[PDB]
Design a protein around this nucleic acid. Structure first.
Ligand SMILES: [K+]
Ligand SMILES: [K+]
Ligand SMILES: [K+]
Ligand SMILES: [Mg+2]
Ligand SMILES: [Mg+2]
Ligand SMILES: [Mg+2]
Ligand SMILES: [Mg+2]
Ligand SMILES: [Mg+2]
Ligand SMILES: [Mg+2]
Ligand SMILES: [Mg+2]
Ligand SMILES: [Mg+2]
Ligand SMILES: [Mg+2]
Ligand SMILES: [Mg+2]
Ligand SMILES: [Mg+2]
Lengths: 232, 467, 75, 110, 50, 53, 128, 160, 190
RNA sequence: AUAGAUGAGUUUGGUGAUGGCUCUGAUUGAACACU
RNA sequence: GACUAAUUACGUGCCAGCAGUCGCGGCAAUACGUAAGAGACUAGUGUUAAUCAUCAUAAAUAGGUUUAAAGGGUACUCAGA
């Protein structure tokens, strides 16, 4: 599969950092998955660090390798989309073979299909990473001019990221309001508060705090993971 | 119309019986059975509100491939509507008159839906078929008659007019048979309904059960056009035919059929009756003296206003669309609720059951109406107080798209003669072969030639008598 | 695995047409009849890119692609 | 070439020859039969319940089906005169045309 | 059960399925039997029901 | 909330497409389960006595 | 059986199958030490033929069993302490045990090259 | 009791195996409850209470059954119309689950699991074509009609 | 092209109607091989009865069976019969069977179950060959009574030909059998 | 927790069944032999 | 040897021996011993012992009893279903 050329990576960096466009808009504009757009920015930010700290880039290695790989040029020539930004994950429940008996003239929609798989399952209309594309396509059906349809799409994505950025802000705040930082002569003691009564009806709760009693060491079991599983 | 829009438009009104209609569902067959045998399955608002939602719903299905309508008892399929109840409401001021206008609003929405139905529709005329029963059938591609069938339109007898789509079917029947059946309110029985053209097939009442169990087996392909589907059902109905009567002859044929074309070709009921007197006169070369005298004794009893209005719609309906027809009739029917003849004819004949003597129309007879009088235009003028009839769909047409499954008529025989150069006997075999041995083709085609065909070229060939 | 959903399809259809007929949609004439008719039947409504198999068998060794040493070799 | 098999079999006495009708079931060949009160109706595709022991009833049924075939052959040959073929080349002969052009295609270059 | 399995009532269903696709995957199906379209719209009648 | 939602569903109206498509079953068979005493139980018992005698 | 018959205890454990080496299976032991009461020869049954080197061992548990001596040539005799393991000689009746070759007194096959771990043979060390 | 439902299930199997167009059942509210669900699910063609002789075949729906009193309650019977499509009975198998010796009850979460084809309790998952009828406080329902109404109850039989 | 050096595919070329090159592209497999013996007036006569399957891998499967004094000849007889007895097998999304099926052949019961995509052919060795030849990719099988090599192939082949047809079950009951997985993704996701 | 359900050798002149045995999978607070 | 992935040569001659099951060895043994090769696991590898699963092989879920293990000699009956 092709790779984002060096020029394309820079274009993505300007639209998200300089022009301030939302990531969902740059994703839908260049057909680049939001997970890749967020990566191109992190990797570019690391280059600015090297260029600022006067570190030599592996330019000989970069050029020689990029010639070996197929590339897409975001901009003038829109030959093909870089990748499909609407790939939905196949949920286990949606994989079952169900033939539901219904009346001979029922309008069985995706909402009805989601409930036929489970009570908590959602239709693919809600499992998209850029769900604003549906509301954008519905505008075209209503003979809405393209220039106006694009306006509502930006305001829709720009407004969705505001809620996401607002949730994360309030989240991190609650994580700090629960920590009492007491500075001593040597270290800084962080007293995190929790509800010691949330241990489940039988004391076996996955999220309970404390070294559980009545369990020996699993250090002699096969397939026992003893290396870090998360570098945060 | 959406599913909820229909369920909300046909809410069960107070007084509706829960089982006026019985609905059955088989493999490919959906059945509608009128279930008021004590009243001869007479239509009413209660049962019209049960049929319309189903027909709209079965139309959204791909597994309902044949729709069959029929009656419950062995005596009647559908014997008119609840006109007796309409005469009472009309006597309760304008508030009661609109209730009647709303009834015809429902009845016409159903007939239009049947006429423009997008699935094969069959009607078992296994009993008397009058009034409302005619509207549920005539607009269908398949209309099966039996020895029990009795067709008639006794609307002019009660000071009314052929109401249910009759302004579209009768005007475009072969010859002047339309106006004759509508004005005189003639009564056809058995195979005569099949020779006239009201029915497309003729079976025996005992063969209908076996026919249904076969129609249910017919599983069409989704990609078959409506034409192919109607061809499969037409060939299936012709398998259960046990033959027409061996001795019963075409009633409206030959001399009588020729007289109808000469007497019912004018645009004034005064001239029509004048022509009938010539036939009834002694020495008339027509030879239908007995028939002409009988029809005269009938017209004198029919409402004189209904004759003018009826004869007027037969001449106008010939150029109307089917959708435009039900809308105009809804306006016409509204004027009859206000008129005096309708309320008198119904109250005198049906509510009184013939007691208190015969009816008393607004004019005592047709002689009271002077020549220059015009008592028809008043009924053909829309009333702004009566909202236009909103049909269940926007489909329409100027002529039935599929109405050539019956016997060949003057139109079919004419086209074959003006197109080809057949002979007397060769032409008859052209239809007996084209229809694949349909019972009655030889007798029908033979009759059409006896009237509208002469040896213009000698024994070599035959052409029309007109020119 | 994943499936591609075109927003243009989900905006115009709610999936009802996929349950027409007897539950699996309308039937199309066999292949030996389509080309016989000079007129090709209208394109059947469906999400673009359907009726193509997914190579599940080729993902037997996917868990190995998550190790750090392997990811370095794939980069 | 593989010998021909009938596209339709009209049996006037199914009860006496079930070997013929069973081979039609295996070969996927439709069949018509006169099913008498003691005959198994599952042996044919289209049943004609009737007395199969009378030569007068067998002649009528057979004659009626003979007229049906005659009436069908007349239409097929009438449509041909108008340039309308009511059938397509069978698969047996169809394949011959393909490999036949291949031999012509082989000599095309050579 | 000494009797044999007679599938005479399903000749069309069986023949139409065998003619739907080609045994050589990747090619259009050959022309079907000449009788397949003749009885396309003439299904068998129900039997054995009492 | 879990109670109201579950009680609402158990007492919800049937689907319209299920009403306009399901065949008819005469209420004389689908709802007449009660079996009352024969209204003529006394007249029949008096006639059965005469015939038995 | 009916639900009533099951409720009264119709389902019982299937009759036990005799183990290959009961002297070891009874006490869950993998091997047992014993003294050789007799070292002789046993004759196979109908199909096979030959002389099978067997030993009558008195296990430390008190049981007297007959063990098969695997390999070519042995060193044990009367009043010899040897280790016994499971596994039987299929063609010999009553020989339901084997002797370990790298045992206390029983020595491993000296001129053995293949499958030395089965016969308690040290590596020749000819290379070193 | 449940024994009548068990007899109704084995009888319909034998009537469909024999390819009978009609079949009679004892007239009980319990048999009527299961028959109405089979008719509501589309497995049978008709239900009519009548005498020891079947009503007129053609005029089956318009049949006028006489009132049921103590003078004829002993001779009443439920007449069922059976379906056969594609040379195969539409009601081939009727396997009971709850029997006189044991009444099997299922919860709402077990029925939700059996509806998608996963075993739960003494039941097994439903496959293509199979149906399951549960006797609940809201009447005899199909497992998918029960989970929709969010109720459990007594499991009657599995209809293939 | 000189592929048939013994004229063995000449008659098969007429019955089926495909070139020898297309015949060699089929997926054949000798499943069962029995050494049967018949006692005659002249002593024992041992034959080699074999069963062979043939398929395209895209919805066609055929079962052949023949015996002969030579093991090589029996494999050719069974192969010709397997290629001419091919039949179309219905598949759900061209990957699995419709629903569950259970067939019995003389004390050998086989139960085949449809499984979701990516489940694989978690079936025994002889069913893996038949599924891998017919084009099936997700299935679960189970022998309930007997594991007779011959009857396990006859029961498995008969089960693939007796799958519940949802198109017929719908017309029989007068109700749609909606393919939930098709409505959910707007089309068939093979 | 919705992916989780699998077989193989061996009785017969031969075939289909019945029915054990053994192997295939995982493991041990193990022991022994060669390392 | 087959189950079970992986071969030849020589020696031995129903002997010596191999063997979890079926089996192998009686003078031209891919089954024993040696040699080389090949197929595997690896600081472990094999073997013995044990447990679960295989085993719808004590079947509540979920079996069976005409001819293969298995219907009581009989049915009136308390308890029980
Ligand atoms: K009637
Ligand atoms: K067994
Ligand atoms: K043996
Ligand atoms: Mg006979
Ligand atoms: Mg032995
Ligand atoms: Mg070596
Ligand atoms: Mg013997
Ligand atoms: Mg090997
Ligand atoms: Mg060894
Ligand atoms: Mg060796
Ligand atoms: Mg280690
Ligand atoms: Mg006894
Ligand atoms: Mg005793
Ligand atoms: Mg005894």
């Amino acid at each position: 599969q092709p790779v984002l050329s060096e020029g394309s990576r820079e274009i993505i960096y300007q639209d998200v950092m300089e022009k301030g466009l939302p990531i969902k808009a740059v994703s839908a504009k260049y057909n680049v998955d939001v997970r890749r757009v967020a990566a191109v920015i992190r990797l570019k930010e690391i280059e600015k660090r090297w260029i600022k700290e006067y570190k030599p880039l592996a330019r000989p290695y970069a050029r020689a390798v990029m010639k070996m790989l197929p590339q897409t040029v975001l901009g003038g020539p829109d030959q093909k989309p870089h990748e499909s930004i609407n790939d939905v994950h196949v949920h286990s429940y949606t994989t079952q073979q169900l033939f539901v008996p219904v009346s001979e003239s029922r309008e069985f929609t995706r909402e009805d299909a989601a409930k036929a798989f489970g009570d908590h399952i959602l239709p693919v209309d809600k499992k998209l990473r850029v769900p604003e594309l549906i509301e954008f396509q519905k505008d075209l059906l209503k003979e809405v001019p393209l220039q106006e349809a694009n306006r509502k799409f930006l305001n829709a994505t720009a407004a969705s990221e505001a809620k996401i950025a607002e949730r994360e802000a309030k989240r991190r705040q609650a994580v700090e309001d629960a920590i009492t930082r007491v500075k001593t002569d040597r270290f800084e003691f962080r007293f995190q508060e929790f509800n010691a009564e949330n241990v489940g009806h039988d004391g076996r709760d996955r999220n309970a705090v404390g070294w559980r009693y009545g369990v020996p060491f699993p250090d002699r079991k096969r397939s026992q993971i003893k290396i870090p599983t998360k570098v945060e | 119309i959406s599913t909820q829009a229909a369920a909300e438009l046909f809410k069960p009104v107070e007084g509706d019986e829960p089982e006026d209609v019985l609905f059955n569902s088989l493999y490919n067959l959906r059945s509608v059975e009128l279930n008021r045998p004590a009243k001869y399955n007479a239509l009413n608002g209660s049962m019209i509100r049960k049929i319309a939602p189903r027909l709209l719903e079965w139309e959204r299905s791909d597994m309902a491939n044949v729709i069959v309508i029929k009656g419950s008892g062995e005596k009647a399929f559908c014997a008119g509507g609840d006109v007796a109840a309409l005469a009472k409401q009309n006597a309760e001021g304008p508030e009661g008159v609109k209730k009647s206008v709303d009834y015809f609003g429902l009845e016409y929405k159903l007939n239009h839906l049947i006429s423009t139905y997008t699935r094969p529709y069959v009607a078992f005329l296994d009993g008397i078929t009058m009034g409302g029963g005619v509207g549920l059938s005539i607009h269908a591609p398949f209309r099966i008659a039996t020895e029990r069938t009795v067709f008639a339109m006794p609307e002019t007898k009660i000071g009314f007019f052929p109401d249910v789509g009759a302004s579209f079917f009768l005007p475009r029947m072969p010859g002047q048979v339309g106006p004759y059946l509508g004005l005189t309110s003639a009564l056809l029985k058995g195979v005569q309904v099949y020779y006239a053209g009201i029915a497309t097939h003729y079976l025996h009442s005992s063969s209908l059960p076996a026919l249904e169990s076969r129609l249910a087996e017919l599983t069409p392909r989704d990609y078959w056009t409506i034409e192919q589907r109607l061809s499969v059902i037409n060939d299936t109905i012709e398998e259960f035919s046990t033959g027409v009567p061996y001795d019963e002859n075409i009633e409206i044929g030959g001399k009588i059929r020729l007289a109808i074309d000469r007497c019912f070709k004018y645009d004034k009921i005064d001239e029509i009756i004048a022509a009938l007197k010539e036939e009834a006169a002694e020495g008339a070369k027509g030879g239908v003296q007995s028939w002409a005298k009988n029809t005269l004794e009938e017209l004198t009893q029919r409402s004189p206003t209904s004759l003018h209005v009826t004869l007027r719609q037969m001449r106008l309906g010939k150029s109307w669309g089917i959708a435009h027809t039900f809308k105009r009739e809804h306006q016409m029917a509204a004027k009859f609720m206000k008129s005096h003849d309708f309320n008198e004819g119904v109250t005198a004949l049906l509510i009184d059951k013939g007691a208190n003597g015969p009816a008393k129309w607004k004019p005592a007879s047709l002689d009271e109406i002077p020549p220059g009088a015009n008592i028809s235009e008043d009924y053909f003028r829309n009333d702004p107080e009566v909202p236009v009839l909103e049909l269940l769909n926007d489909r329409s047409y100027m002529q039935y798209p599929y109405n050539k499954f019956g016997l060949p008529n003057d139109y079919d025989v004419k086209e074959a003669i003006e197109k080809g150069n057949f002979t007397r006997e060769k032409l008859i075999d052209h239809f007996v072969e084209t229809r694949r041995g349909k019972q009655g083709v030889r007798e029908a085609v033979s009759d059409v030639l006896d009237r509208m065909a002469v040896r213009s070229k000698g024994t070599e060939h035959v052409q029309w008598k007109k020119e | 695995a994943v499936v591609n959903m075109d927003p243009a399809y989900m905006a115009k259809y709610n999936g009802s047409e996929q349950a027409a007929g007897r539950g699996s949609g309308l039937s199309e004439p066999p292949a030996y009849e389509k080309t016989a008719d000079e007129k090709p039947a209208k394109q059947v409504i469906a999400n673009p890119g359907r009726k193509v198999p997914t190579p599940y068998e080729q993902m037997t060794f996917a868990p190995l692609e998550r190790r750090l040493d392997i990811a370095i070799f794939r980069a | 070439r593989r010998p021909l098999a009938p596209d339709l079999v009209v049996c006037l006495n199914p009860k006496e020859n079930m070997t013929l009708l069973y081979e039609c079931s295996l070969a996927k060949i439709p069949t018509i039969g006169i099913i008498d009160t003691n005959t198994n109706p599952s042996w044919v595709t289209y049943q004609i319940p009737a007395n199969d022991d009378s030569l007068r009833a067998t002649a009528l049924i057979s004659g009626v089906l003979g007229r049906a075939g005659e009436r069908g052959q007349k239409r097929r040959l009438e449509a041909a005169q108008r340039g309308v073929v009511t059938w397509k080349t069978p698969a047996d002969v169809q394949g011959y045309f393909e490999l036949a052009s291949a031999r012509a295609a082989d000599a095309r270059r050579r | 059960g000494k009797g044999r399995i007679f599938q005479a009532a399903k000749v069309y269903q069986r023949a139409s399925e065998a003619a739907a696709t080609n045994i050589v995957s990747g090619l259009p199906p050959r022309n079907p039997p000449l009788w397949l379209k003749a009885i396309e719209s003439i299904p068998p009648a129900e039997i054995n029901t009492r | 909330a879990r109670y109201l939602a579950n009680k609402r569903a158990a007492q919800a109206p049937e689907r319209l497409d299920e009403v306009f498509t399901r065949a008819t079953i005469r209420e004389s068979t689908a709802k007449n389960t009660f079996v009352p005493l024969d209204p003529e139980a006394f007249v029949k018992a008096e006639e059965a006595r005469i015939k038995h005698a | 059986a009916t639900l009533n018959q099951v409720m009264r205890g119709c389902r019982k454990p299937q009759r036990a199958r005799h183990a290959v080496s009961p002297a070891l299976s009874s006490i869950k032991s993998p091997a047992l030490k014993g003294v050789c009461v007799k070292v002789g020869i046993t004759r196979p049954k109908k199909p096979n033929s030959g002389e099978r080197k067997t030993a009558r061992v008195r296990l430390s548990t008190g049981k007297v069993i007959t063990a098969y001596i695997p390999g070519e040539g042995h060193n044990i005799s009367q009043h010899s302490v040897v280790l016994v393991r499971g596994g039987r000689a299929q063609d010999c009746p009553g020989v339901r045990y084997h002797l370990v070759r790298g045992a206390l007194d029983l020595a491993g096959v000296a001129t053995r090259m293949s499958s030395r771990s089965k016969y308690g043979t040290k590596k020749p060390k000819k290379a070193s | 009791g449940i024994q009548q439902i068990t007899n109704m299930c084995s009888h319909l199997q034998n009537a469909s195996r024999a390819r009978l167009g009609l079949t009679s059942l004892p007239n009980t509210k319990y048999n009527l409850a299961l028959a109405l669900a089979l008719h509501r699910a589309g497995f049978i063609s008709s239900i009519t209470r009548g005498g020891p002789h079947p009503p007129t075949p053609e005029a089956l729906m318009t049949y006028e059954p006489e009132p049921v009193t103590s003078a004829n309650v002993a001779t009443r019977r439920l007449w069922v119309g059976l379906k056969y499509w594609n040379e195969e009975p539409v009601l081939k198998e009727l396997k009971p689950i709850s029997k006189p010796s044991r009444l099997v009850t299922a919860s709402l979460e077990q029925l939700n699991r059996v509806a998608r084809g996963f075993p739960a309790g003494y039941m097994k998952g439903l496959q293509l074509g199979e149906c399951l009828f549960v006797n609940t406080d809201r009447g005899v329902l199909e497992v998918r009609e029960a989970v929709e109404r969010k109720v459990g109850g007594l499991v009657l039989c599995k209809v293939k | 092209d000189g592929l048939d050096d013994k004229g063995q595919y000449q008659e098969l070329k007429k019955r089926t109607g495909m070139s020898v090159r297309q015949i060699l592209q089929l997926k054949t497999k000798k499943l069962v091989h029995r050494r049967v013996v018949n006692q005659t007036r002249l002593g024992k006569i041992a034959s080699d009865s074999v069963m062979v399957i043939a398929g395209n891998g895209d919805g066609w499967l055929g079962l052949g069976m023949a015996k002969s004094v030579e093991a090589s000849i029996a494999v050719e007889k069974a192969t010709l019969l397997a290629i001419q007895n091919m039949q179309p097998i219905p598949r759900y999304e061209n990957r699995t069977i419709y629903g569950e099926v259970t067939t019995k052949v003389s004390g050998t019961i086989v139960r085949l179950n449809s499984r979701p995509p990516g489940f694989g052919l978690r079936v025994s060795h002889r069913i893996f060959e038949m599924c891998r030849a017919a084009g099936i990719r997700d299935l679960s099988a189970k022998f309930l009574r007997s594991r007779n090599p011959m009857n396990t192939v006859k029961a498995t082949y008969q089960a693939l030909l007796s799958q519940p047809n949802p198109e017929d079950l719908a017309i029989g009951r007068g109700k749609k059998l909606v393919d939930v997985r098709k409505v959910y993704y707007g089309g068939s996701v093979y």
